[PDB]
């Protein structure tokens, strides 16, 4: 079994990468791909409280997303790992840290403690970080589709840069400034190299 | 202003105490009585998920009690404190510590870190602990019939948990002997609060 997460800011090509990588991996591996809360009823119901929120405090939101993360883990991720499957997950604890912790200003130490309570030691075996520069990410966001949004996008990237260099062993960084075909290829090769050892 | 919480296991006479202490304090103080979720929409929605839960993982449950606590603190407790009011709260952080941390076995430190993220430094100015023995509490719970072993043990653990919390802390905790008849429990609690308020 293997628990693989995919991380990156928006404009990193994350959606295209996970989908294309998952498609190639299914041919040879007992692999599943899941997008948190991945249709888990309780997880989806918790998520709805946030989404229906009227000017919801960011900490309440973070705690509800952490509760949803855990329901997804206990009812979907853990049973698939116990069945010996490889699990590809579209976002996980590093997202909460870069977005809620760093970018939204709750604090790194606080969001990490929250994430650690939700995951109870279940860290990914491998995390693919889609390493995009703020400028390439910006052009991809525009190409696919504000000063405050640009600054927030820069803080998310800065947050990921701080995280990645603190847990180097788990993290495998892919150059996401390349065309998406190369980003997909490098990610696939990185995962295969991990799965074959 | 003053933020006063009331803690105790079931059978400590907590409901009677808070209500009777509220009816006495209202004569002289701009005081409110609340509990989580306390009509707060998001808190009420969180409560429904917890009540509809089929063998819900204890950590998910702890995170949901923490999210409800934050909603109730920001939308109800903090605005009343900013108005200069006396806020009496039935159960707060210490309940999660004794129930989720100790009795459920998650770990008091882990549950404390979760609840500190939830409360963001907003600790009660005063916490009344209704100190009941497991045996007196048991007899009160039965009155509301013999209580099964699972319930008796869980009740004993909650008490053990509260004993650990009160000992490893204090300076906000004021313990009231809840083994006394409820009239005396009410009187001691009232006197404790008045001495604090001045
Ligand atoms: C405040 C609190 C209470 N309890 C206990 C106290 C003894 C009674 N139980 C069971 C119970 C009874 C009635 C309603 C209920 O559901 C609640 C109560 C408060 C808050 C929520 C929620 F909004 F957080 F979900 C649900 C639970 C909960 C905990 O285990 N932890 C806490 O943080």
From Swiss-Prot, chain B:
<keyword id="KW-0808">Transferase</keyword>
<feature type="binding site">
    <location>
        <begin position="8"/>
        <end position="15"/>
    </location>
    <ligand>
        <name>ATP</name>
    </ligand>
</feature>
<keyword id="KW-0418">Kinase</keyword>
<dbReference type="GO" id="GO:0006227">
    <property type="term" value="P:dUDP biosynthetic process"/>
</dbReference>
<keyword id="KW-0067">ATP-binding</keyword>
<dbReference type="InterPro" id="IPR039430">
    <property type="entry name" value="Thymidylate_kin-like_dom"/>
</dbReference>
<dbReference type="InterPro" id="IPR027417">
    <property type="entry name" value="P-loop_NTPase"/>
</dbReference>
<keyword id="KW-0547">Nucleotide-binding</keyword>
<dbReference type="InterPro" id="IPR018094">
    <property type="entry name" value="Thymidylate_kinase"/>
</dbReference>
<dbReference type="InterPro" id="IPR018095">
    <property type="entry name" value="Thymidylate_kin_CS"/>
</dbReference>
<dbReference type="GO" id="GO:0006235">
    <property type="term" value="P:dTTP biosynthetic process"/>
</dbReference>
<dbReference type="GO" id="GO:0004798">
    <property type="term" value="F:dTMP kinase activity"/>
</dbReference>
<dbReference type="GO" id="GO:0005829">
    <property type="term" value="C:cytosol"/>
</dbReference>
<comment type="function">
    <text>Phosphorylation of dTMP to form dTDP in both de novo and salvage pathways of dTTP synthesis.</text>
</comment>
<comment type="similarity">
    <text>Belongs to the thymidylate kinase family.</text>
</comment>
<protein>
    <recommendedName>
        <fullName>Thymidylate kinase</fullName>
        <ecNumber>2.7.4.9</ecNumber>
    </recommendedName>
</protein>
<dbReference type="GO" id="GO:0006233">
    <property type="term" value="P:dTDP biosynthetic process"/>
</dbReference>
<dbReference type="GO" id="GO:0005524">
    <property type="term" value="F:ATP binding"/>
</dbReference>
<keyword id="KW-0545">Nucleotide biosynthesis</keyword>
<dbReference type="Pfam" id="PF02223">
    <property type="entry name" value="Thymidylate_kin"/>
</dbReference>
